[PDB]
């Protein structure tokens, strides 16, 4: 009913490795250079091709970004075990379980902001003064949406693009009735 | 003598009290030294306005005394006042060197001004233009 | 380059200025030190580099830098650099410099 | 060095204010050593008056 | 958060910078305790007032605040948000309005009094310049 | 306290060949050589923070790069070098650098 699929700007997913790793073994292994020791306890990787994004906890326990596509972000799982395997520490692949996916898309119509966030005022909840976008929290499922002026719409808080896509068409017709001209 | 509170005695005593410094130097031995941070308070020249009287999400009016006669105002007009490192350090031994501005007229408040006096508006008026501010010569 | 030619030159004097009273205090003769000197300058005209007055993991005739920096940061591919205070061995031409730029983008 | 002297100029304006209107002679702190009669109303029955 | 939602709700508009001045609360946290405060009031349950401060603060008669609620809510109604809290279109409302008389107010004057950009006046100047042909009464 | 990437040069090579040319002969203490060296950093430190003043800018793309400790793993494939005249055209550099404020 929509007529158009929301993109996704990222997608967030955890994959532990049961395996405890050591950071400054692999700073010392490694082929790199932008960190800081005393910035935080997790080391952080993007490697090329697919501009993945791992932050790799003292235990193995890990929760991969960067990413726009689940198999992505599990081959890319795959070349880290690989690489800490290639160091010569265990690292065996485990659960690929997203807790966030990202997303944002666009309408293309004027819209009225007022009437959304005093209509919707169980959820809608807008400002204009220091953000130019709504924030809208549906419960069911528990998604939250932001409404731009220019219909940029960013999506993020479901775990599956199913999901996110179920709000897109949940939202599409109180964004289509609450437009603007 | 409301002329003369406005004009002279206003001045005064606001100068025979102008200065307050709290002028750091260490209040303690170390802080190595450390120098002597003049924090000064003076005030200079007042000013003194017609009398002027905002309202809420209003503009500030030039009053007149028929309409704070009507609407229960205070006819008042307001004071604002100028106010005034550049240092010199002591250790211990030798001493009795060990002695600020970024603004210029402040606020300070309002005044209930009494009405044919110098700053009021009814002293300047010619008999027709009293008439016409509806008020009795 | 007559910046390059004279700064290897200062370079040159010295070290030959340092090292006179390190072989006195060792007690060895400048005829061993001009020795090392004449290897000095047969090395510099072997390498003859500028004109001169005499996968994943981690895998001469490449190009070689050492330098100091400012500041470095990237625009999510592109990495800038500020440089300072720095030396350049370039296709077997060396330059130096006391500011310099790495405009590079990685992909 | 600003923000106090708004609520200053509150309190110098509102003490003034206060002694015309009410004729005690004194702050707001319940007319200590001060006189009564000081701030009477204008009399305007009558011109000689 | 509690002032600024009372004055609001007493229908008294007062900026943000002039909060922020008053108590720097580094525009943060007060924003969050202002959406907290919204959905507190929100379960227990006025740009065009901006205007008459600023003219206020720059001492112009009453005909010119008239001129600027009729622009103000002439181009609130068509188009261009254009400015990312349009309070800046609308003090350019003023801008143009003053530009339609002839008083010397010029923006270079007008930025710190109003402690507003002079770059996003001429911006204001332009995207109106290209649209002049409904904002004028008589 | 100051780093000793002053071997990576040409003139650090020379440096260090001859120096290992006396270690060979057997003249040269260990201590002192450092010591040496370590004056070498020194001097070759001040000279090239004063002795030198034009300025030259390489332009490229890089290959290399990633996330670890200061020592800076950047290879630039295909680059250009210009000084001030002279314009140099550039099939692969490596870039190595460390940190340049005084850590302590």
């Given amino acids: 009913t929509s007529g158009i699929v929301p993109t996704l700007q990222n997608i967030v997913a955890t994959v532990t490795l049961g395996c405890r790793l050591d950071l400054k073994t692999v700073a010392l292994h490694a082929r790199n250079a932008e960190y800081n020791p005393k910035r935080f306890a997790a080391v952080i990787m993007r490697i090329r091709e697919p501009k993945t994004t791992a932050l790799i906890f003292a235990s193995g326990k890990m929760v991969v970004t960067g990413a726009k596509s689940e198999d992505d972000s599990k081959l890319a799982s795959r070349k880290y075990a690989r690489i800490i395997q290639k160091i010569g520490f265990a690292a065996k692949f485990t659960d690929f379980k997203i807790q966030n996916i990202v997303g944002s898309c666009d309408v293309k119509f004027p819209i009225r902001l007022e009437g959304l966030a005093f209509s919707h005022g169980t959820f809608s909840s807008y400002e204009p003064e220091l953000f130019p976008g709504l924030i809208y929290r549906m419960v069911k499922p528990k998604i939250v949406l932001l409404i731009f002026v220019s219909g940029k719409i960013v999506l993020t808080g479901a775990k599956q693009r199913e999901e996110i896509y179920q709000a897109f068409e949940a939202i599409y017709p109180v964004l289509s009735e609450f437009r603007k001209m | ?137 | 380059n007559a910046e390059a030619s004279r700064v290897y030159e200062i370079i040159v004097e010295s070290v030959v200025n340092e090292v006179r009273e390190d072989f006195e205090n060792a007690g060895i003769d400048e005829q061993t030190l001009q020795d090392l000197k004449n290897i000095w300058q047969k090395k510099l005209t072997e390498t003859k580099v500028t004109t001169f007055s005499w996968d994943y993991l981690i895998s001469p005739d490449e190009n070689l830098m050492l330098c100091l920096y400012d500041k470095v940061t990237r625009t999510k591919a592109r990495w800038k650099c500020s440089l300072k205070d720095g030396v350049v061995t370039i296709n077997r031409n060396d330059y130096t410099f006391q500011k310099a730029q790495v405009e590079a983008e990685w992909v | 060095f600003n923000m106090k002297l708004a609520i200053n100029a509150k309190t110098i304006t509102s003490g003034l204010k206060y002694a015309l209107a009410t004729g005690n002679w004194g702050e707001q702190k319940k007319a200590m050593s001060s006189r009564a009669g000081v701030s009477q109303v204008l009399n305007r029955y009558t011109y000689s008056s | 958060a509690s002032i600024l939602i009372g004055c609001r709700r007493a229908e008294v508009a007062r900026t943000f910078k002039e909060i922020q001045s008053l108590i720097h609360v580094k525009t943060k946290e007060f924003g969050k305790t202002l959406n907290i405060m919204k959905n507190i009031l929100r379960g227990k349950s006025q740009n065009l007032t901006y205007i008459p401060r600023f003219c206020s603060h720059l001492g112009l008669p009453m005909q010119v605040t008239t001129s600027a609620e009729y622009t103000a809510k002439k181009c609130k109604e068509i188009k261009e948000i254009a400015g990312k809290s349009p309070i800046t279109i609308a003090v350019v409302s003023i801008y143009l309005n003053i530009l339609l008389f002839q008083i010397p107010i010029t923006a270079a004057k007008v930025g710190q009094t109003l402690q507003v950009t002079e770059g996003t006046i001429k911006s204001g100047y332009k995207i109106l310049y290209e649209h002049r042909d409904k904002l004028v009464d008589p | 306290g100051y780093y000793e990437l002053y071997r990576r040069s040409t003139i650090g090579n020379s440096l260090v060949d001859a120096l290992d040319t006396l270690i060979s002969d057997g003249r040269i203490e260990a201590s002192l050589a450092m010591r040496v060296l370590e004056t070498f950093d020194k001097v070759v430190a001040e000279t090239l923070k004063d002795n030198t003043q034009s300025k030259l800018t390489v332009k490229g793309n890089l290959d290399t790069y990633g996330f670890c400790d200061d020592v800076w793993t950047f290879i630039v494939k295909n680059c250009q070098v210009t000084v001030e005249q002279s314009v140099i055209s550039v099939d692969k550099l490596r870039i190595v650098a460390c940190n340049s404020k005084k850590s302590e």
């Fill in chain 2, 1 to 137: 003598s409301f002329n003369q509170f406005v004009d002279y005695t206003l001045q005064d005593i606001i100068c025979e009290d102008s200065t307050l410094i709290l002028e750091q130097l260490a209040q303690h031995t170390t802080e190595s030294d450390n120098i002597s941070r003049k924090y000064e308070i003076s005030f200079g020249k007042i000013y003194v306005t017609k009398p002027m009287v905002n309202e809420s999400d209003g503009v500030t009016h030039a009053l007149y005394p028929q309409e704070a006669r009507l609407r229960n105002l205070t006819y008042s007009s307001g004071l604002f006042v100028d106010v005034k490192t550049y240092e010199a350090i002591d250790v211990p031994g030798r001493e009795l060197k060990y002695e600020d501005s970024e603004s210029g007229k402040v606020f300070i408040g309002r005044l209930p001004i009494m009405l044919r006096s110098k700053n009021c508006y009814l002293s300047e008026a010619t008999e027709s233009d009293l008439y016409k501010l509806k008020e009795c010569p």
